[PDB]
Design a binder for this molecule. Structure first.
Ligand code: FDW
Length: 910
């Protein structure tokens, strides 16, 4: 009753729009989504209440683990004969006195085995229990749990110690793991009971194939089409029928009419049989203007665009009158139509509005059931008669050359052109294609989607199609694959094989491809919502990725409604998310004042204003005692205003410092430092840092310890976000305060026997960033955007642009003599040294490794075409990595290409 109203106010604060605004949406799909999605909410809540309190603690503090338990050979070599030295802390009695217990145990020990050994070492002091029964009431390993010292990360599940990311990181970085022994009931009491209630809104024919007609759509008239009548002569509505991004028939234009009276009243006839309309078929249209002329070819220009699903969410072929409010053209539309554009009516009703009428067949026309589709596919099945079409092959028509040809085709990258010969070939051998499952994306593109006979047969292949790798399945969720049977199969592969580690890794892409879904309620959204509601680490980022796009009206409805369903069932975390949302709001409003009102003032004056505004009661309270949106395991305690400052970077970002209120903060970090940036789109850096992380993981598995630094970056809104401060790091320019300056600095920071490890870490990190930046075509490097850690770890910051941002393949990271001197340990002939030869071998090995995983990187960029990133608008942008990775060329030709690009950039050496 009263509790619903309170919850509605909390959800409203979280999503940035009131819940009541969803209640007033008349669209039945919106109301059905809101109602129907609640079953995912029920399901998720039940799984959390299954084995309470542990199942609830597993939701709140899920194990931060690697996908595979298996440790690479060079990582195992860092261990002392397969054993790890672990420190276990116990907070005991008054004065909260900390007591450490250092243990030497097998890397694959279960946390309960780790707890047992710690209590044995604690008990060892009492030499009485030591001899007779060392157990001490079965060491009550079930009465305690291990927590990471300095952050809210627990070891609640039976995994091997080394599989937990904190431990693997400790091994790799040569750091001592510090864990805190905590009583189970101390954590369980912190965990509040989940009181999920259903909202008040929870309470509230002929077949397509029996229509022997071609498709017709009526264009009536347009309103709100205001244009300079002195400039423009006439206007017209351009239309087309599409399956995803590809047309199913030729485009049909209306008659040209003067803009003073846009009233066509024309029935446009399409070259498509109504039964041949695929499930995902859409009407794509646009209002264009035509003028000119100068005696030269006419001047066409799109004014506004709009896309419609030819079938509604209930499988009903759209009928009757319909009005579509159009969208404004985005810069760089290489056609008069925008089929990759969002399907639907513009929420702003004071925009061009085209009135349409569809056909009516004296009955509700519905898309056929799978029983009708199966029967038709089975029905669609002499020796020489198969020879009449290159698109069909009979019983035993699979040669050994053709089998190897299909294998060769499946290897090729997603951006590789499949010829029409290859499309007929793939389709004719579709039944053999089942034996090579990974070929599915190629075979699907070979289908004639404007043929019900082919599509029905393809549907039966997809039904009994063997599972493919999650990474291979993700391609099938991009814009190229609109069919629900194909997309449904892809979601089913992720449900079965995607680990929560990998889901967290690829969550940005999965959130993006939701935008390519025809309907609000689909298999993908249900999959992602259930995962977000059964894992709070996933849920946190699911919330922020959706919230960061709420300002974009192309996705605000879908994302708003999805966020509402999330908030209604996430539990206690809503209260915590709201603290973060308010904290961000105060930082946005404060930085907005500094960019608008106080921009033309000195740092002393600006800082005076910052300090005064921060010390305000409402501000102080809002901005302290919340969880870092960058990593919600990090508690941000009280602000250290003396350590906070306005940065000298443009867009004047705030450098913020909070106390870490963890009892063992000293063993991780006492102060949490974050850069709040207002002015830059953080999405490009977010995707680059994700790719860097993936590249590093590839190299590590292959046995190349090339340490990268994919620091934390999170977009929280329209050109607003957070950036992780890398501790003990400085830019090359701030080091230079000659060529030996950098090497001399690292020598002083790493004196004695540690020197050789610092040079090694420098060379290795340098090699990783050299390869990564060249492949990705990152923005040009310089002394202010290259940083070095005290230990010697080199890394880059502020990516900004990737791929061909110039608009012939650049080398962003040119190694000056400064870097080569450090590499060669202070040598005269920097080129001809064993240290440089070692360094080159690292770059070559790293280059080829990424070449082998090319399909993943192409696919991660492809799924990202949905977001409005300026340098990632078409598949031609993505094609830059086809060039840098030299995919058309051979492996030896690729090394020669890489060597030549490095040779030309550095003026010799390679
Ligand atoms: C002091 C300054 C040179 N700086 N800038 C950044 C940074 C600031 C803004 C950024 O924007 C992007 N995209 N990467 C960025 C990196 C950064 C950082 N992360 N860590 C440390 N210790 N110092 C940093």
């Amino acid at each position: 009753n009263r509790e619903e109203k309170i919850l509605n106010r909390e959800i409203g604060f979280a999503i940035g729009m009131p819940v009541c605004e969803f209640d007033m949406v008349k669209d039945p799909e919106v109301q059905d989504f809101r109602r129907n999605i609640l079953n995912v909410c029920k399901e998720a809540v039940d799984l959390r209440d299954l084995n309470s309190p542990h199942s609830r603690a597993m939701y709140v503090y899920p194990p931060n683990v690697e996908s595979s338990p298996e440790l690479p050979k060079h990582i195992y070599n860092k261990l002392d004969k397969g054993q790890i030295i672990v420190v276990i802390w116990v907070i005991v009695s008054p004065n909260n006195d900390k007591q450490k217990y250092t243990l030497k145990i097998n890397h694959d020990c279960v946390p309960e085995q780790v707890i047992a050994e710690a209590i044995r070492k604690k008990t060892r002091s009492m030499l009485l229990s030591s001899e007779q029964l060392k157990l001490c009431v079965l060491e009550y390993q079930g009465k305690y749990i291990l927590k990471v010292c300095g952050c809210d990360e627990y070891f609640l599940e039976k995994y091997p110690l080394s599989q937990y990311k904190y431990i693997r990181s400790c091994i790799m970085l040569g750091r001592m793991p510090n864990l805190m022994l905590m009583a189970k009931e101390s954590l369980y009491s912190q965990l509040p009971m989940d009181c999920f209630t259903m909202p008040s809104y929870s309470r509230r024919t002929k077949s397509l194939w029996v229509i022997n007609s071609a498709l017709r759509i009526k264009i009536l008239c347009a309103t709100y089409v205001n244009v300079n009548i002195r400039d423009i002569d006439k206007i017209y509505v351009r239309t087309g029928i599409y399956h995803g991004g590809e047309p199913l028939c030729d485009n049909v234009n209306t008659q040209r009419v003067p803009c003073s009276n846009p009233r066509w009243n024309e029935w446009l006839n399409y070259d498509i049989y109504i039964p041949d309309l695929p499930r995902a078929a859409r009407l794509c249209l646009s209002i264009c203007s035509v003028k000119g002329r100068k005696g030269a070819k006419e001047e066409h220009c799109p004014l506004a665009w709009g896309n419609i699903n030819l079938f509604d969410y209930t499988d009903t072929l759209v009928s009757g009158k319909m009005a579509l409010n159009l969208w404004p053209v985005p810069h760089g539309l290489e056609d008069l139509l925008n089929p990759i554009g969002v399907t639907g009516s513009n929420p702003n009703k004071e925009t061009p509005c085209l009135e349409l009428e569809f056909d009516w067949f004296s009955s509700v026309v519905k898309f056929p059931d799978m029983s009708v589709i199966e029967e038709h596919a089975n029905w669609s099945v002499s020796y020489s008669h198969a020879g009449l079409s290159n698109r069909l092959a009979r019983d035993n028509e699979l040669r050994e050359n053709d089998k190897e040809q299909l294998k060769a085709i499946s290897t090729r990258d997603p951006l590789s052109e499949i010829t029409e010969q290859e499309k007929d070939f793939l389709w004719s051998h579709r039944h053999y294609c089942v034996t090579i499952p990974e070929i599915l994306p190629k075979l699907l593109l070979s289908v004639k989607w404007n043929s019900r006979d082919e599509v029905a047969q393809m549907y039966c292949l997809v039904k009994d199609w063997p599972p493919i790798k999650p990474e291979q399945a993700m391609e099938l969720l991009d814009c190229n694959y609109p069919d629900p049977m194909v997309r449904g199969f892809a979601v089913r592969c992720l449900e079965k094989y995607l680990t929560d580690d990998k889901l967290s890794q690829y969550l940005i892409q999965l959130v993006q491809v939701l935008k390519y879904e025809q309907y609000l309620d689909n298999l993908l959204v249900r999959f992602l919502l259930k995962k977000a509601l059964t894992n709070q680490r996933i849920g946190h980022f699911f919330f922020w990725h959706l919230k960061s796009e709420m300002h974009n009206k192309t996705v605000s409805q879908r994302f708003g409604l999805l966020l509402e369903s999330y908030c209604r069932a996430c539990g206690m975390y809503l209260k915590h998310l709201n603290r973060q949302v308010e904290a961000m709001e105060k930082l946005i409003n404060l930085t907005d004042i500094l960019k608008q009102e106080k921009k033309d003032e000195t740092q002393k004056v600006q800082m005076k204003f910052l300090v005064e505004q921060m010390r305000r009661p409402d501000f102080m309270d809002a901005l302290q005692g919340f969880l870092s949106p960058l990593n919600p395991a990090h508690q941000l305690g009280n602000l250290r205003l003396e350590e906070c400052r306005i940065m000298s970077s443009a867009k004047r970002p705030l450098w913020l410092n909070w106390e870490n209120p963890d009892i063992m903060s000293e063993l991780l970090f006492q102060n949490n430092e974050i850069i709040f940036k207002n002015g830059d789109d953080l999405r490009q850096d977010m995707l680059t840092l994700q790719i860097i992380r993936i590249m590093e993981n590839i190299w590590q598995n292959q046995g190349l310890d090339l340490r990268m630094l994919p620091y934390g970056c999170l977009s929280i809104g329209d050109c607003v976000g957070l950036i992780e401060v890398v501790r003990n790091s400085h830019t090359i320019m701030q080091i230079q305060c000659n060529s030996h300056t950098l090497h001399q600095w690292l020598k002083d920071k790493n004196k004695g026997e540690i020197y050789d490890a610092a040079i090694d870490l420098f060379t290795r990190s340098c090699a990783g960033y050299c390869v990564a930046t060249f492949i990705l075509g990152i923005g040009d490097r310089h002394n202010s955007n290259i940083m070095v850690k005290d230990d010697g770890q080199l890394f880059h910051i502020d990516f900004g642009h990737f791929l061909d941002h110039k608009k012939r393949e650049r080398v962003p990271f040119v190694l000056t003599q400064d870097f080569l001197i450090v590499i060669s340990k202070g040598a005269q002939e920097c080129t001809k040294t064993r240290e440089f030869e070692r360094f080159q071998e690292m770059c070559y090995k790293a280059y080829l490794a990424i070449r082998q995983h090319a399909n993943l990187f192409i696919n991660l960029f492809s799924m990202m075409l949905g977001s409005g990133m300026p340098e990632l608008q078409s598949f031609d942008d993505i094609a830059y990595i086809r060039k840098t990775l030299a995919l058309d060329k051979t492996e030896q030709e690729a090394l020669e290409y890489f060597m030549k690009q490095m040779n030309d950039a550095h003026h010799g050496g390679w």
